[PDB]
Amino acid sequence: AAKDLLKADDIKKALDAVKAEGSFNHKKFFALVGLKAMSANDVKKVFKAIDADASGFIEEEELKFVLKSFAADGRDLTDAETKAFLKAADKDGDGKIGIDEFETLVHEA
Template identity: 45%
Template sequence: SSKITSILNPADITKALEQCAAGFHHTAFFKASGLSKKSDAELAEIFNVLDGDQSGYIEVEELKNFLKCFSDGARVLNDKETSNFLAAGDSDGDHKIGVDEFKSMAKMT
């Protein structure tokens, strides 16, 4: 998404995606992509891209396609990666990730 590449360095995104080839871990991705260094406002903008249906939450299907938001050619997350990602970010137990939860995840790296 051009919105994402206006916030994150495309080379950092590429590096982060390459690291995910063997397995996805959100903290490694957030750090490598530069997400962990972004402001709340920038993280909110990225969250809005990730929230494909604009529900205000990133749900399971959107989590599966998380990497594809950064590059069309990226893979989907497998079920285990998706459930681990959800468990790490879903602090209130509603089975989805809100914008504040997303910001917290990014800053925990």
């Protein structure tokens, strides 16, 4: 459901930059899409979407399908690509990326 909030071309540039099988980075991808500077409000709303299960948290499984809201079958993480997002979005090593953690990494991307 984040397709209406964004763009379009912004999703075609980030995915075209990481479509490879292991070329995803979390900083270059989100940096191109535009979430880096969207508005903390519409950002907490972007995360609310990343939370595919409704646990106010981004779990590793969501990280794999993190691009489903932008494309139902858009990017499909390769596993190693998921080990990058998790090791780049989790610092406390809790296995869960809350908002401040998510809106902090997405904005600093």
